[PDB]
């Protein structure tokens, strides 16, 4: 959650704004002015730069979009109300309304765009459709409001009046209860409500019934409540005269726009009142707030301004394997809707989760730490979504550090250590420690007696490497343990508060973000005479980092809209981009845009997924590239690094030098790059080995285009057998003539029947098995498939003997049916077990024919036994 | 429907109105001249409450938590609030029937048989307005804004918070007919307006609605219940009654309706007035019943002074097939789920749904009097068409209903009875202890298996076609719960000692034993794969493994390829199956074959590179193409299509393959020594030269210096 100023545009001739309202749907910012001055702007450097100066004399002072059918509306303080539609790319003046007796304090839409509500200073309350104005006209009383707002189902429509009294009204004028007040308690002046905004759920809800409503009074106290409570997140903010209040888009941070005495300010909540920042706007006066339709920017009034403020979401997203997860909510839904998108096979796995406090990733495997309805729990899953674990633990996991071999979830006072595998499964021992608790080197199990002392130094970040765990509090005194048997080694008394802390690969060096943007790098094992010193480094605006895993010194971070890449504290040339990084490894970062995923949650592209390439490995393909393999070798020589080399030998390879390329694959211990340099050796045509080297990179299809162009059917056919492109391998029969087609023919056939068979799609398989002549899973096909007759024609269709006879006959002995069964043995060898079949399922009559038929009638007694 | 007695404390006198505190924690009686504390937790009593000379007919609370009134017959109401104290006795010229406040605005209406008062709280006066008849019931609308008054007449008024008659409703049959109880389905927006809560001194007295969708459900005395809207039209029809009516109410959520009256018990009827059974038989006649607020509790009241507090349990009825769960909504409703497209579908019964039973292309449903069977139509694997078949009308007594292609079995006590759609009686097997279980197990279209588990502790298959049991097992004591192998191989038994046995069923032959299990339900996939769930765990077995216990609310239901599909308050639940923790347990055994066949139900792809890798150097290679195949490596694949080709060749030494296998990883030291040990170390000095590491080439000069 970082915040910062981005671009001020401007409004001609000092006019003074008084009313901004982003639209939502489509990005128009329409803003009003202070002499009739009524503009609509539009980004992307402005695109729809307009005036609608259509009527409106004198001042503007309300202005709201209608979100669906996109009509604006605007208001002057002479009464006159105006609609705006947009007819060819410009907005015009119609529907235009006039009651001649006060002036329009403020106007609303419904939840669905079908009714306004308009209340004029007098206390006349007009609320029309979209066409007709006069719905229902009601007068009210010795009153005069100031604001009005529906709820979710445009039931309620609360007013508010100037004396600072809310209204619960009816969808029609019936007076309801008054709202009980319960943020001012202690005050004692005037009171005038200066901000209210219902959030109805339209985006889903940041928990299942979290606060919606939000009411502020100018003096600087707010309450968020959900409908009509009694108690509700109260919420003191020093702003003399907050002057707006605006929800966001998910309704999951409230902005809440006033200046303190001190000088601008806009400060933040989350709908549970916890605070997040101060963006200390300049100019003289906020006047209003809007966010964008995508919670990405917050376009504010000042005085002749518009200045727009970028803001950073916490997102809830991870990187695991080879898989982007990202999580989100949805209005149909009321769980977090959780998407393990996986990158190489394009493949979705949507999961449902109902906490979701927060996600985890690291190596192939991911914390879904939630709440349940043992009261928290920790999903430990797959790069596929799959939960391999939930372990219940008593402690709030606020915030999770994840290695390899541990996890450790730790709330406000406490945290928490589990092992989850071995460097290779479950191991657990888990532990609780107070902050306090000075645990010595090893040890008692699971005592949650620890977890309930309370402190007075908050926990306000953790991590944890392979080695050492660094938990951060609230007044910078990170404390330091020995992973694997946690205990309390050093504290270092940093300046700041941490909100986010990582360590390099060696885990000497520690990077902070502190609740700011600002960030430096400490270090921990370095003795002064002290313990730990600062690094004599400092950025401004920071909001993601991540260090290499292989280099101890490589290190990234994003600043503002910028990726700087450091070697041991020495920045390179930025990287424009807009994306958090993913992974950094082997001199390169895929790092993947959230913002434009997000916009689509349904349908992530793989255009959002981007690598970069730091410095040297730039310089490595651009000098193979201009000079030849010949001289990029021995630059290549002057610094090594395994991803360097490989690069050249998959240069040389593309060339076939043969010669450079097998120098590379030694230098990158790498046997197999050998081995298939030597085969690539053996063949003697080109064409042919440009067809191996192709195959090499992975483009099989080229390879096969390839290979059927120089008129080598056999070589397709081959290649699309090594691989399980049966379906391939039968196109490809299906045309020209080779030197054994049936065989491959019959082949494919059996191995696509095997394809479908693993997946449990008979069916698919039966109508393969066929065309190719299987029997052994023909039968167990059928049988799976209950398709008796099926197996009675293919129990009469193997030769007189088989191995296959006897299993039939068993499945036709389970499945009850006897005539069948009794012919099925008599097919293959055994009578016997075609009586005791007979005697087994009951038909004893048969039983004794057989018996007959065959001369051994030692069944005498049994029908008598059976005579009962 | 079931209702357990929690305790029956009798008072001394008639009970007249009941009154929950709106938290749910002390219920206000109504005795003679007192009113009684009780508390809901156990049956105790409180106090009765003195302020009242003579015999109070109502009582009410605030729907806030403080204010609750009593009126009574010394011709006063007493505004008594929380903490047992009394605060303003305004009172009239008569006795108070029924006083009730508004759930809106806390403005108490008390009527009486002259006259019906309203007193909001900031109001310094009562405002009296006269009335025609003796007023019996007052029910405010669910959003406070109209007070509709049923009278001895037989006339219900219905007024406004300033008392004008808006619209009155005319109930046939007269003075000879007086509505008796009235009651406002609660069920609106405005019901959680107040789920977020936190010196007797007298009073004076002072002498569209069409679009709105409420129900006023009226009980005569001429013995009939109706179901009115707000605009005076009736919905449906008079639904006619044996007993005469004195109570009518509703649910937390308005779902249900109590009814009782004259004759000495308490219904169930739904919203739309069909009976669904009985709360309880009482001894006296029954003048309140009163569910208590957010639970299934509810407190019956009669002219003994006996008071009972009620629990309804409302049983899970439910059947599954293998994809297709169709349960019982709303104590009327079928709903048929299918588990993999999620595509629901309601039907409509009318009447109480005692037992669901499902099979491939069958639904059969027993209603009270007659059992509805129902097919799918359609050749579709997603269709859900469920087209009437037949409706075989008679009066049904019987434990368990399983359906069959073309048959029903009805299991009645030992009697097992097999029942053709038409109606006729096919045929009769008369088992010889209790059937406790009894399990359709698939076969042909007609004849088909079923499998009886019996308290005797036999186990039976029973074939629809030969009167014949076929005995399993005779394992000790009774089978809760029975199931069968994806392959009618195996058998599951769990025998009231929570305590999965599993049997091989053709050699009558255990297998192994779990310690706790309420329910069953093996793979229909993959043989190999157990799922019981006992005490609140699931526990997945594979063979003859140890268990992956999770925790869990619920028992298994089924059990379909990758989904433990759990129960939990009529709330089915997919569990997704860790399939990648099976997979190791096969590998670390060296059972590759097995490995991929668990592997298929999807797992990662690192997981399928460990398989692959595993099954190269075990020398598994089938497995091992397989495996990459599934992974997509060209390299390893070329790799082992060499190696094949040199076994089809003469080739046969396993030291040499191993050898390739760890050399083309990357070992290239324990590769060295499987060259060395065959007779090769010519090929681990071609290795260690083509690594150029003659370090180590110099002591693999085995052969000598022959050039």
Same mark, same amino acid.
């Given at each position: ?83 705006? *539609? ?70 309620? %429509? %609360? ?47 940041? #928990? ?76 003289? #006066? ?270 990234? *971070? ?66 193979? #590239? ?26 040389? %390879? ?64 081959? %290649? ?137 009638? #030692? ?10 | ?359 491939? /292309? ?43 292609? /073309? ?247 396993? +030291? ?33 030269? +083509? ?17």
């Amino acid at each position: 959650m970082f915040f910062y100023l981005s671009k001020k545009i401007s409004i001609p001739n000092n006019v003074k704004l008084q009313c901004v309202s982003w639209n939502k749907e489509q990005g128009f910012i329409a803003c009003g002015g202070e002499d009739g001055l009524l503009k609509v702007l539009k980004l992307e450097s402005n695109l729809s730069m307009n005036q609608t100066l259509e009527g409106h004399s004198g001042s503007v002072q309300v202005v709201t979009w209608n979100e669906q059918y996109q009509k604006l509306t605007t208001s002057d303080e002479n009464g006159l109300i105006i609609v705006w *539609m947009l007819y060819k790319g410009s907005w015009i003046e119609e529907m235009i309304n006039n009651r001649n007796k006060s002036v329009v304090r403020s106007m609303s839409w419904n939840a669905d765009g079908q009714k306004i509500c308009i209340v004029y200073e007098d206390g006349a309350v007009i609320v029309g459709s979209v066409d007709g104005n006069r719905i229902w006209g009601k007068d009210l009383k010795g009153i005069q409001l100031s604001h009005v707002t529906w709820s979710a189902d445009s039931k309620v %429509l %609360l007013f508010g009046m100037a004396n600072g009294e809310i209204h619960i009204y009816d969808n029609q004028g019936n007076f309801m209860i008054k709202m009980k007040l319960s943020c001012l308690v202690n005050v004692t002046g005037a009171i005038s409500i200066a901000g209210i905004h219902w959030y109805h759920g339209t985006e889903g809800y940041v #928990e299942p019934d979290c606060p919606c409503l939000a009411v502020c009074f100018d003096n600087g106290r707010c309450q968020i409540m959900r409908h009509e409570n009694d108690q509700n997140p109260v919420l003191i903010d020093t702003g003399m005269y907050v002057v707006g209040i605006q929800w966001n888009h998910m309704g999951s941070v409230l902005a809440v726009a006033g200046f303190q005495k001190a000088v601008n300010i806009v400060q933040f909540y989350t709908p549970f009142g916890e605070h997040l920042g101060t963006l200390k706007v300049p100019g003289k #006066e906020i006047s209003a707030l809007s966010w964008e339709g995508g919670g990405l920017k917050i376009a504010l009034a000042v005085d002749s301004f518009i200045y727009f403020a970028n803001i950073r979401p916490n997102y809830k997203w991870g990187y695991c394997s080879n898989t982007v997860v990202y999580a989100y909510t949805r209005p149909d839904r009321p769980e977090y809707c959780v998407v393990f998108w996986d990158t190489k096979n394009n493949e979705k796995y949507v999961k449902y989760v109902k906490g979701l406090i927060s996600i985890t990733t690291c190596g192939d495997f991911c914390i879904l730490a939630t709440k349940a309805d043992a009261t928290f729990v920790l999903v430990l899953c797959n790069s596929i979504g799959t939960p391999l674990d939930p372990k219940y633990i008593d402690i709030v996991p606020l915030f999770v550090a994840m290695t390899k071999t541990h996890v450790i979830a730790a709330s406000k006072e406490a945290f928490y250590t589990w092992q989850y595998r071995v460097a290779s499964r479950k191991e657990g021992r888990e532990r609780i420690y107070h902050v306090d608790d000075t645990p010595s080197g090893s040890m008692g199990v699971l005592d949650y007696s620890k977890t309930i002392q309370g402190t007075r130094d908050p926990i306000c970040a953790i991590t944890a490497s392979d080695k050492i765990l660094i938990v951060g509090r609230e007044s910078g005194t990170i404390q330091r343990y020995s992973l694997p048997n946690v205990g309390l080694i050093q504290k270092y008394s940093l300046n700041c508060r941490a909100y986010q802390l990582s360590l390099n690969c060696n885990s000497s060096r520690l990077a902070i973000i502190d609740i700011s943007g600002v960030l430096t790098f400490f270090d921990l094992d370095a003795r002064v005479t002290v313990v730990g010193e600062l690094l004599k480094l400092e950025r401004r605006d920071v909001w993601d980092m991540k260090w290499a895993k292989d280099n101890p010194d490589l290190f990234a *971070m994003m600043e503002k809209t910028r990726m700087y890449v450091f070697r041991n504290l020495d920045p390179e040339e930025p990287i424009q981009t807009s994306g958090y990084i993913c992974n950094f490894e082997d001199l390169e970062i895929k790092s993947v845009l959230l913002d434009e995923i997000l916009k689509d949650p349904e349908h992530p592209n793989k255009d959002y997924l981007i690598n970069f390439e730091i410095r040297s490995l730039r310089d490595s393909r651009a000098l193979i #590239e201009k000079v030849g393999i010949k001289d990029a070798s021995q630059f290549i020589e002057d610094n090594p690094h395994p991803r360097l080399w490989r690069l050249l030998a998959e240069a040389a %390879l593309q060339k076939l030098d043969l010669y450079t390329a097998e120098q590379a694959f030694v230098r990158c211990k790498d046997y197999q790059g050998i081995k298939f340099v030597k085969r690539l050796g053996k063949l003697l045509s080109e064409s042919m080995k440009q067809a191996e080297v192709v195959g090499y990179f992975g483009r099989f299809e080229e390879a096969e285009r390839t290979y059927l162009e120089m008129d080598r059917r056999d070589l397709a056919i081959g %290649l699309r057998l090594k691989l399980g492109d049966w379906f391939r391998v039968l196109q490809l029969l299906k045309t020209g003539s080779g030197d054994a087609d049936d065989s491959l023919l019959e082949q494919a056939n059996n191995a696509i029947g095997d394809y479908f068979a693993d997946r449990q799609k008979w069916l698919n398989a039966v109508q393969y098995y066929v065309q190719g002549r299987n029997q052994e899973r023909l039968a167990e096909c059928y049988y799976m498939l209950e398709d008796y007759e099926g197996l009675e024609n293919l129990a009469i269709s193997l030769p007189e003997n088989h191995k296959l006879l006897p299993e039939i006959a068993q499945m036709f002995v389970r499945v009850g049916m006897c005539e069948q069964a009794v012919t099925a043995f008599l097919k293959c060898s055994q009578p016997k077990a075609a009586v005791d079949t007979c005697v087994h399922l009951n038909q004893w009559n048969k039983a004794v024919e057989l018996a007959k038929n065959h001369s051994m009638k #030692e069944i005498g007694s049994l029908l008598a036994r059976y005579a009962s | 429907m079931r209702a357990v007695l929690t305790w029956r404390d009798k008072a001394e006198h008639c009970i007249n109105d009941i009154a929950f505190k709106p938290d749910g924690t002390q219920l206000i009686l109504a005795a003679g001249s007192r009113l009684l504390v009780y508390d809901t937790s156990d049956g105790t009593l409180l106090q009765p409450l003195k302020g009242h000379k003579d015999t109070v007919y109502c009582v009410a609370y605030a729907k806030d938590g403080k204010r609750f009134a009593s009126g009574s017959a010394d011709k006063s109401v007493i505004i008594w609030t929380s903490k047992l104290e009394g605060i303003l006795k305004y009172t009239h010229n008569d006795a108070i029937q029924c006083v009730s406040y508004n759930p809106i605005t806390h403005q108490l209406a008390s009527c009486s048989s002259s006259d019906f008062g309203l007193w909001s709280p900031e109001q310094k006066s009562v405002s009296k307005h006269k009335s025609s008849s003796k007023i019996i019931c007052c029910s405010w609308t669910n959003d406070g804004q109209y007070l509709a008054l049923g009278m001895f007449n037989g006339i219900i008024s219905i007024r406004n918070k300033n008392g004008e008659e808006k619209v009155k409703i005319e109930r046939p049959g007269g003075s000879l007919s007086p509505i008796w109880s009235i009651c406002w389905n609660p069920s609106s927006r405005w019901e959680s307006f107040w789920m977020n809560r936190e010196i007797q001194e007298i009073p004076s007295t002072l002498k569209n609605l069409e679009e709105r969708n409420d129900i006023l459900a009226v009980a005569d005395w001429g013995q009939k219940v109706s179901f009115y809207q707000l605009s005076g039209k009736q919905i449906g029809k008079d639904r006619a009654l044996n007993f005469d009516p004195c109570c009518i109410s509703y649910f937390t959520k308005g779902e249900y309706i109590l009814l009782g009256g004259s004759d000495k018990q308490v219904s169930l009827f739904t919203k739309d007035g069909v009976r669904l059974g009985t709360v309880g038989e009482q001894n006296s006649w029954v003048w309140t019943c009163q569910a208590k607020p957010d639970s299934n509790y509810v407190v019956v009241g009669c002219q003994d002074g006996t008071i009972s507090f009620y629990q309804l349990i409302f049983s899970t009825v439910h059947g599954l097939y293998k994809d297709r769960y169709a349960y019982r909504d709303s104590m009327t409703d079928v709903i048929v789920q299918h588990l993999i497209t999620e595509q629901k579908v309601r039907i409509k019964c009318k009447e109480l749904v005692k037992k669901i039973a499902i099979y491939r /292309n069958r639904l059969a449903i027993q209603l009270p009097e007659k059992i509805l069977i129902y097919e799918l139509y359609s050749e579709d694997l997603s269709d859900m068409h469920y087209r009437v078949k037949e409706k075989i009308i008679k009066k049904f007594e019987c434990n368990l209903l399983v359906v069959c292609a /073309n048959h029903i079995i009805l299991c009645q006590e030992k009697r097992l009875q097999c029942l053709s759609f038409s109606g006729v009686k096919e045929r009769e097997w008369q088992m010889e202890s209790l059937i406790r279980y009894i399990k359709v197990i698939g076969g042909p279209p007609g004849r088909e298996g079923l499998l009886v588990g019996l308290k005797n502790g036999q186990i039976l298959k029973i074939f629809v076609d030969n009167l014949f049991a076929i005995v399993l097992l005779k394992q000790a004591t009774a089978v809760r719960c029975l199931d069968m192998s994806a392959s009618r191989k195996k058998l599951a038994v769990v025998d009231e000692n929570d305590t999965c046995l599993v049997y091989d069923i053709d050699t009558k032959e255990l297998l192994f034993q779990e310690p706790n299990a309420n329910s069953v339900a093996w793979n229909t996939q993959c043989e190999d794969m157990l799922c019981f769930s006992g005490g609140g765990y699931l526990n997945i077995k594979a063979s003859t493994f140890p268990v992956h216990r999770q925790k869990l609310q619920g028992f298994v239901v089924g059990y379909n390829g990758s989904k433990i599909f759990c129960l939990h308050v009529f709330s089915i639940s997919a569990v997704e199956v860790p399939q990648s923790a099976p997979m190791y347990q096969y590998l670390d055994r060296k059972l590759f074959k097995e490995a991929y066949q668990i592997a298929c139900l999807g797992v990662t792809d690192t997981d399928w590179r460990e398989l692959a890798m595993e099954a190269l150097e075990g020398l598994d290679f089938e497995t091992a193409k397989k495996a990459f195949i599934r992974v997509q490596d060209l390299r390893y694949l070329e790799l082992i299509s060499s190696i094949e080709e040199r076994k089809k060749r003469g080739e046969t030494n396993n +030291d040499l393959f191993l050898a390739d296998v760890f050399s083309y990883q990357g070992k290239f030291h324990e590769a060295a020594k499987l060259y060395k040990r065959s007779g090769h170390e010519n090929l681990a000095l071609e290795m260690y030269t +083509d690594l150029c590491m003659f370090e180590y080439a110099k002591d693999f000069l085995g052969s000598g210096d022959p050039k």
